[PDB]
């Protein structure tokens with residue numbers, strides 16, 4: 185059975201106005217800004233942006249890749265598909 189989200193989990197993350205996007209739950213570095221209550225720091229592959237999202241917008245990658253893991257015209261998306269498949273746990277700083 186599923187557990188709660190934890191750092192390192194791979195997802196497609198949904199934001200208003202954008203396709204379900206390859207992403208990971210990030211850790212929060214010591215001394216870094218913490219997310220709001222009940223939100224997770226989501227790092228978006230390809231764009232390398234961070235937003236804070238709750239579980240309703242987080243789809244586990246294994247379950248969802250057949251639906252959401254196809255190329256998209258949007259900036260950064262296809263780079264992000266490579267990242268989540270090929271090196272999802274690397275530093276992209």
Ligand SMILES: CC(C)N1CCC[C@@H](CO)C1
Nearest residue numbers: 202205228231233234235
């Ligand atoms: C869809 C995704 C790559 N972006 C676009 C909006 C900003 C970013 C994180 O704040 C999420």
